[PDB]
Write a protein that binds this ligand. Structure first.
Ligand SMILES: O=c1[nH]cnc2c1ncn2[C@@H]1O[C@H](CO)[C@@H](O)[C@H]1O
Ligand code: HPA
Ligand SMILES: [Zn+2]
Ligand SMILES: [Zn+2]
Length: 355
């Protein structure tokens, strides 16, 4: 892959067709911060697992897709999160998990990603077939390292723990303890699923930072919530370095100023927000006004295996419907690298290699 430099960003895209634009999108040196490894599979990988383990013998491929994935516009975040629970059928042994991780790296390299942060949920992957969380973790860390070494370190991978099991104090403590225990591999900690104001778990998140682990949580995504409290908590109480989505920052001048004052970056997932019905359309997506207001934002794919969309698709949508330029896209990837949780050298070397 012959990546675009900072000295090649004046390209005239107006005469290119969709196909030729995707070559440019691919060639952009991307840093992706918000993507769930759990569902980071191609359609063929997914159908290969469903067939190999004989999970849906009476369903056709089209039916398998309607039943497990989320490729069409839905109602809400809540609907997405509850539907996602059924494809946990695939997390059947530790080989499926290791392969998932390895292929995810390969797919991201081919899309032109150079610094990839993946996040996974131990509880998501473990509960269906009662798999051991540490054995999952082992499988995940082997797969990712397998792929990186095979690619001669042409893509670098960071790993984040999306902690869950539930919102009981015991479950959330356990989830944070799993991450802390594996902090040699986890560069950050997340909360996902149904959106929550995490104020009752400040004690746990303090602990995680005490242990040297950066926080990026999902907050300010779900537009059905009649307040912005999850955002205030993430910023003031959790001391997040980044926010997953955080698009509802756009609804408050006070929060716009707060995130800029703290140099917090918003992990924006354009297509996710459309499909999960958190913006009216891509035309009206808040990323535009947030970028224009000086908020640091990056571009991400979120759940590519469920959406049947990839990182470059999100770039296409931002170009076509919101008129982001190549220079804008390069700026955001520079921000994504700078605000990455991986080793500071890896960042600096990537920065001077491309940006
Ligand atoms: O499709 C998915 N991929 C990855 N993670 C998911 C998905 N659906 C839900 N979670 C959610 O992430 C939680 C962390 O607080 C997971 O346990 C689960 O609730
Ligand atoms: O709960 C979630 N899990 C995984 N990806 C997501 N993207 C938005 N919400 C979620
Ligand atoms: Zn264990
Ligand atoms: Zn997400």
């Amino acid at each position: 892959i012959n990546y675009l430099t900072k000295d090649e960003l004046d390209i005239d895209l107006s005469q290119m067709d969709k196909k030729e634009r995707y070559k440019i999108w691919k060639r952009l040196p991307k840093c992706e911060l918000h993507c769930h490894l759990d569902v980071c599979f191609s359609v063929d990988f997914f159908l290969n697992v469903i067939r190999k383990y004989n999970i849906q013998p009476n369903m056709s491929d089209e039916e398998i897709i309607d039943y497990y994935l989320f490729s069409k516009p839905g109602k809400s975040l809540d609907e997405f999160v509850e539907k996602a629970l059924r494809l946990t059928d695939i997390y059947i042994d530790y080989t499926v998990v290791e392969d998932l991780a390895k292929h995810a790296v390969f797919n991201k390299y081919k899309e032109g990603v150079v610094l990839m942060e993946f996040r996974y949920s131990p509880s998501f992957m473990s509960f269906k077939h009662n798999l051991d969380k540490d054995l999952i973790h082992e499988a995940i860390v082997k797969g990712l390292n397998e792929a990186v070494a095979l690619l001669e370190y042409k893509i670098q991978v960071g790993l984040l723990c999306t902690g869950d099991g539930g919102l009981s104090h015991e479950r959330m403590k356990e989830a944070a303890e799993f991450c802390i225990k594996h902090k040699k591999d986890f560069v950050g900690y997340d909360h996902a699923g149904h959106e929550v104001d995490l104020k009752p778990f400040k004690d746990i998140f303090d602990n995680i930072r005490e242990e040297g682990i950066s926080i990026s949580v999902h907050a300010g995504e779900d537009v059905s919530i009649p307040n912005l409290n999850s955002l205030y908590t993430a910023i003031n109480l959790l001391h997040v370095k980044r926010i997953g989505h955080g698009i509802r920052v756009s609804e408050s001048q006070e929060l716009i100023d707060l995130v800029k004052e703290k140099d917090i970056l918003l992990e924006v997932c354009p297509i996710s927000n459309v499909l999960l019905n958190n913006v009216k359309s891509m035309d009206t997506h808040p990323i535009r006004m947030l970028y224009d207001a000086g908020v640091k934002v990056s571009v991400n794919s979120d759940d590519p295996g469920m959406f049947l969309t990839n990182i470059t698709d999100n770039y296409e949508e931002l170009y076509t419907h919101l008129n982001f330029t190549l220079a804008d896209f390069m700026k955001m990837n520079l921000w994504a690298v700078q605000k990455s949780f991986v080793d500071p050298d890896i960042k600096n070397k990537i920065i001077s290699k491309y940006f």
